[PDB]
Design an enzyme around this catalytic site. Structure first.
Site, PDB file in Angstrom:
ATOM      1  N   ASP A 389     -55.288  75.879 -90.491  1.00 12.00           N
ATOM      2  CA  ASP A 389     -56.751  75.726 -90.567  1.00 12.00           C
ATOM      3  C   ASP A 389     -57.447  77.083 -90.443  1.00 12.00           C
ATOM      4  O   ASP A 389     -58.483  77.301 -91.050  1.00 12.00           O
ATOM      5  CB  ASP A 389     -57.269  74.763 -89.475  1.00 12.00           C
ATOM      6  CG  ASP A 389     -56.363  73.582 -89.177  1.00 12.00           C
ATOM      7  OD1 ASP A 389     -55.294  73.795 -88.579  1.00 12.00           O
ATOM      8  OD2 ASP A 389     -56.731  72.452 -89.533  1.00 12.00           O
ATOM      9  N   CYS A 423     -57.681  76.002-104.864  1.00  9.66           N
ATOM     10  CA  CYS A 423     -58.087  75.903-103.461  1.00  9.66           C
ATOM     11  C   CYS A 423     -59.583  75.535-103.464  1.00  9.66           C
ATOM     12  O   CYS A 423     -60.002  74.829-104.380  1.00  9.66           O
ATOM     13  CB  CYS A 423     -57.795  77.191-102.691  1.00  9.66           C
ATOM     14  SG  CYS A 423     -58.741  78.631-103.243  1.00  9.66           S
ATOM     15  N   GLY A 428     -59.476  82.870-102.870  1.00  9.12           N
ATOM     16  CA  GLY A 428     -58.767  83.370-101.697  1.00  9.12           C
ATOM     17  C   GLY A 428     -57.317  82.962-101.609  1.00  9.12           C
ATOM     18  O   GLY A 428     -56.425  83.769-101.897  1.00  9.12           O
ATOM     19  N   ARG A 429     -57.080  81.702-101.195  1.00 10.21           N
ATOM     20  CA  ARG A 429     -55.750  81.113-101.068  1.00 10.21           C
ATOM     21  C   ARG A 429     -55.056  81.085-102.441  1.00 10.21           C
ATOM     22  O   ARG A 429     -53.874  81.418-102.533  1.00 10.21           O
ATOM     23  CB  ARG A 429     -55.862  79.707-100.459  1.00 10.21           C
ATOM     24  CG  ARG A 429     -54.647  79.295 -99.638  1.00 10.21           C
ATOM     25  CD  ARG A 429     -54.833  77.936 -98.982  1.00 10.21           C
ATOM     26  NE  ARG A 429     -55.761  77.985 -97.851  1.00 10.21           N
ATOM     27  CZ  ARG A 429     -56.039  76.960 -97.052  1.00 10.21           C
ATOM     28  NH1 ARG A 429     -55.459  75.782 -97.246  1.00 10.21           N
ATOM     29  NH2 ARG A 429     -56.878  77.110 -96.038  1.00 10.21           N
TER      30      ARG A 429
END
Length: 496
Positions: A389, A423, A428-429
């Site tokens: 998370d 994502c 980002g991810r």
């Protein structure tokens, strides 16, 4: 087009003082948050007072407090200056207060000796290769080393840079307020030697490209920070990637974007054959697998997503997030329940079988077009569920084992289209998974004796989709994933 409004080494206090002594009403600067590592602060001067605005980055995007969401700090600054607005009731972004610090510039090397710079230019550098280093004999002064193997047709020329009363010069003429101001002027107006030789500042010397086998030494050097300096240097190059995103800005396409300001570049966006819009870009590694970096599905974009997967002949979907993460939707469920069949506009999807593993869930899907003879093809959806998370995974093994399976599935299907990676914002991810996959593919085929360059690969991916790879934590994780992969390969060589 260099990034100057970003001050990397100052405190909140020094920002307040600079804007009240050098700046006026409308003056602004961006700086990393000393209190919140990974976050940033927008310090704006207004009515003889300095206001500090928080810019958070949780790994998916830049979140300006009281403002909107952006892919990069350069796109955030460009938005409020080309010319839009923000509340806390207006805060004017008029004058960028320029930073004189050269640390985060590609050409700057700091404490480096003459013999070190000479060997690096003769081995790594070519025509127009330049660097700026600190002078050991003259404290405060700098040395510009320019390249223009036993033939003698090439040479290394050294130019002295004197620092006098906070100003920089080459021993004559103009006195510059910063080292960056000096470099930009002589990059544009090259120095001519008395005998005719033009001292062209074409490109900075590459100091980030390493051989895959020596990863352990580079990781050890960056850990004791080096990772931060390299990442901040990469962030300074974002002003060069402000390409047009006109299609995403159109009124008919505004609700097709999860985040209003995180848009695909026009020259790389996925164009849908008959509306042609989707917030997705083709990622093509340039130095042959390709990728589609896209946002998480919106209720109204589900049909367009399947139109994209069908037209591009994509067979593998990499889902990097859960449907809801930290109390906010990252992706809408665009696939049917196990054994069920559903129609998504003109597209038909069958969820054949769900296979659960430790780090991920694999969904075997059958995609076809309604009323059309054998348009049917198997689409393998890989749903990664163990990404924490907060931050990045503590062990890169999970991501690597997952990508090895994704790679093998992709390779087993002849003429398979780009791998779809998504994502929240799809930057980002999504950027992290794509960069790791590109880097491990070079090592898998060409071997451990092939050269790799982590920030150069990211910059190349960033020119194809805005702000690919968001945080320093993700950047460091890419290095950790590459190192773990090499260590695994060397263990294989040892045991057979």
């Amino acid at each position: 087009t260099s990034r100057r409004w970003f001050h990397p080494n100052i405190t909140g206090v020094e920002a307040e003082n600079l804007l009240l002594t050098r700046g006026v009403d409308g003056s602004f600067l961006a700086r990393p948050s000393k209190s919140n590592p990974g976050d940033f602060t927008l310090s704006v001067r207004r009515n003889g007072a300095v206001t500090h605005i928080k810019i958070q980055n949780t790994g998916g995007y830049y979140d300006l407090y009281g403002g909107e969401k952006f892919a990069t700090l350069a796109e955030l600054v460009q938005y409020y200056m080309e010319h839009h607005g923000q509340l806390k009731d207006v805060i004017e972004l008029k004058y960028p207060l320029n930073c004189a610090d050269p640390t985060s510039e590609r050409w700057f090397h700091g404490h480096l000796s003459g013999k070190e710079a000479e060997k690096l230019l003769t081995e790594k550098g070519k025509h127009g290769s330049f660097l700026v280093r600190e002078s050991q004999s003259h404290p405060g002064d700098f040395v510009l080393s320019v390249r223009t193997s036993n033939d003698g047709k090439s040479k290394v020329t050294h130019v002295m840079i004197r620092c006098q009363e906070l100003k920089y010069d080459v021993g004559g003429g103009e006195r510059f307020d910063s080292l960056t101001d000096l470099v930009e002027h002589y990059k544009k107006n090259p120095m001519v030697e008395t005998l005719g030789t033009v001292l062209q500042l074409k490109q900075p010397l590459n100091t980030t490209r390493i051989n895959a086998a020596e990863i352990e030494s580079r990781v050890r050097e960056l850990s004791k920070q080096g990772f931060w300096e390299e990442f901040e240097t990469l962030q300074q190059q974002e002003c060069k990637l402000l390409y047009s995103r006109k299609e995403g800005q159109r009124q008919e396409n505004k609700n097709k974007n999860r985040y209003k300001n995180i848009l695909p570049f026009d020259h790389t966006r996925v164009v849908l054959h008959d509306s042609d819009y989707i917030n997705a870009n083709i990622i093509m590694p340039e130095f042959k697998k390709s990728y589609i970096a896209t946002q998480g599905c919106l209720q109204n974009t589900v049909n367009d997503f399947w139109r994209m997967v069908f037209q591009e002949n994509s067979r593998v979907i990499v889902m990097t997030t859960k449907e809801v993460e930290r109390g906010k939707s990252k992706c809408v469920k665009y696939w049917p329940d196990e054994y069920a069949l559903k129609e998504y506009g003109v597209m038909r999807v069958r969820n054949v079988k769900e296979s659960a593993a430790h780090d991920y869930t694999l969904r075997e899907l059958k995609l076809s077009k309604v009323g059309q003879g054998n348009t049917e093809r198997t689409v393998w959806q890989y749903h990664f569920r163990t990404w924490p998370d907060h931050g990045v995974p503590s062990d890169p093994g999970g991501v690597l084992d997952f990508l090895e399976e994704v790679h093998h599935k992709q390779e087993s299907i002849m003429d398979a289209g780009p791998v779809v990676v998504h994502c929240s914002a799809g930057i980002g991810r999504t950027g992290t998974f794509i960069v790791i996959d590109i880097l491990i593919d070079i090592i898998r085929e060409k071997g451990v004796d092939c050269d790799i360059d982590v920030p150069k690969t990211i910059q190349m991916v960033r020119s194809q989709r805005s702000g690919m790879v968001q945080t320093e934590a993700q950047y460091r994780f890419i290095y950790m994933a590459v190192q773990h992969y090499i260590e695994t390969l060397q263990r294989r060589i040892e045991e057979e």
